[PDB]
Paper text:
The biological degradation of water-soluble gallotannins, such as tannic acid, is initiated by tannase enzymes (EC 3.1.1.20), which are esterases able to liberate gallic acid from aromatic-sugar complexes. Here, for the first time, we biochemically and structurally characterize three tannases from a single organism, the anaerobic bacterium Clostridium butyricum, which inhabits both soil and gut environments. In each structure, the catalytic triad and gallate-binding regions in the core domain were found in very similar positions in the active site compared with other bacterial tannases, suggesting a similar mechanism of action among these enzymes, though large inserts in each enzyme showcase overall structural diversity. Furthermore, we solved the structure of one of the enzymes (CbTan2) using X-ray crystallography and have modeled the structures of the other two enzymes (CbTan1 and 3) for comparative analyses.
Numbering used by the authors: 1 to 115, 136 to 490
Write the structure that this text describes.
């Protein structure tokens, strides 16, 4: 049974670098009635002063937003967390959210290596929804405000945040939720925060080649982390003859798809590509990059009015591929920008012809290790493979659910202008689709920033506090 116990708790203190929080913790809560993996458990953390009638940033016990960060990366299992230090030694979001005054709910979710493999698509999404449904089933007994649920994640976890924010209350998920015996409740949320979300997977190959066809040297650094030791993997290479042809073919599939989304900029111009991948949607991406650089130049410019002999962050005033006239980025050598950031992944970047990508495994099943999830890669398969049910592929794509479900009103999307894990076109399609349908989006491409997340948490919290007042 799923009735929350406000008495089964411990009062804990965490001190780090001389910074202390005191909190009530309800740990290892089963959020569904028929779990299939030990990972399906959540922790709830509450600033302890709330139970003495204190306020924090104006929030009280029952009014504070509920922050829901997830731990998913590479579509791996994402286990429940607690206040402390993360894998890079920095003070983590749970700790800093509690100190800011939020209730924090950290929910573990299955992933592609769970198990019988029980955590393939759509498990990670179903599990998040069930956690949210547990909180709502217990609204009267749970601390915090379940009308102010804010999700947060990075990379694959940023995609899980986006799907949850986009697909509120869709009946597509009902059979899986009934399977794990989840509560019968609504699972929409107030706001979704996403860092470099790796999403829209069945279109990401053609978008990546749209961006990188012609640029055949790739460079990647993998940082597999452990408790004591270290293992670094650095890949450098050149596309093969076959991969150069695959690249060119994937690139030519992108325009058809982009045009079918019927996107518009803020001036109601239609955003389109011709069959060579040029046109108004390309001008738009280009202008995002210019505006990213312009913001970084804005700092360096002021910093120079004083001293002037100083060099700034990103050495932005020294990037050759930027055309600067009068402290203003006026144009950009697109070829040089791409040459600066460089390709990272081979072609295809997501749906491998040999079924070896993490996305291939995520679209496996309880029996099949991996599947394809594009028509191209199934056609040109190098191994014996099957196509994943297009009904399951949909369950992971938030673009399919904006304009036809209970979508969160407020959106914060961040993607580093130097993050080449996915084409810049993806975060852009997501923001444009949301803005075109009347949603409120805070979208930025931070200059010089590679594949990462949670690097501006003070601004994230301030965004939460602002939308809370609206």
């Amino acid at each position: 049974m799923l009735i929350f116990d406000d008495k089964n708790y411990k009062v804990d203190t965490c001190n780090i670098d001389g910074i202390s929080i005191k909190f009530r913790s309800f740990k290892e809560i089963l959020y569904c009635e028929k779990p299939v993996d030990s990972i399906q458990k959540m922790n709830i953390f509450v600033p302890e002063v709330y139970y003495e009638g204190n306020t924090i940033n104006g929030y009280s016990l029952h009014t504070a937003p509920i922050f829901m960060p997830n731990t998913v990366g590479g579509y791996m299992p994402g286990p429940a967390d607690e206040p402390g230090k993360d894998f890079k030694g920095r003070i983590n979001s749970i700790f800093r959210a509690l100190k800011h005054g939020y209730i924090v709910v950290s929910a573990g979710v299955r992933g592609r290596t769970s198990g019988k493999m029980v955590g393939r698509a759509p498990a990670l999404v179903v599990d998040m929804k069930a956690a949210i449904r547990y909180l709502r089933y217990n609204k009267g007994r749970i601390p915090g405000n379940t009308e102010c649920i804010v999700t947060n994640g990075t990379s694959a976890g940023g995609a899980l945040s986006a799907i949850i924010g986009a697909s509120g209350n869709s009946e597509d998920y009902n059979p899986y939720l009934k399977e794990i015996g989840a509560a019968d409740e609504r699972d929409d949320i107030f706001a979704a925060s996403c860092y470099c979300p790796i999403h829209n997977l069945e279109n990401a190959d053609a978008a990546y080649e749209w961006q990188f066809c012609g640029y055949n040297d790739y460079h990647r650094i993998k940082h597999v982390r452990s408790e004591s030791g270290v293992k670094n993997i650095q890949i450098d290479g050149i596309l093969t003859e076959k991969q150069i042809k695959i690249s060119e073919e994937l690139k030519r599939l992108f325009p058809k798809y982009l045009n079918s989304l019927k996107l518009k900029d803020s001036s109601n111009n239609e955003l389109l590509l011709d069959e060579n991948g040029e046109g108004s949607f390309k001008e738009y991406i280009k202008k995002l990059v210019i505006n990213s650089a312009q913001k970084e130049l804005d700092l360096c410019s002021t910093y120079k009015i004083i001293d002037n002999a100083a060099v700034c962050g990103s050495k932005i005033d020294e990037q050759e591929y930027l055309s600067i006239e009068d402290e203003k980025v006026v144009d950009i050598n697109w070829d040089g920008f791409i040459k600066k950031i460089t390709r990272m992944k081979v072609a295809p970047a997501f749906d491998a012809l040999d079924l070896k990508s993490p996305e291939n495994e995520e679209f496996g099943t309880e029996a099949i290790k991996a599947k394809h999830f594009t028509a191209y890669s199934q056609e040109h398969s190098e191994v014996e493979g099957t196509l994943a049910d297009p009904k399951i592929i949909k369950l992971l794509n938030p673009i399919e659910y904006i304009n036809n479900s209970d979508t969160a009103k407020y959106w914060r999307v961040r993607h580093g202008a130097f993050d080449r894990d996915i084409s810049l076109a993806m975060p852009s399609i997501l923001s444009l689709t949301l803005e075109n349908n009347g949603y409120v989006v805070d979208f930025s491409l931070p200059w010089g920033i590679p594949h990462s997340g949670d690097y501006d948490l003070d601004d994230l919290f301030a965004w939460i506090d602002e939308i809370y007042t609206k």
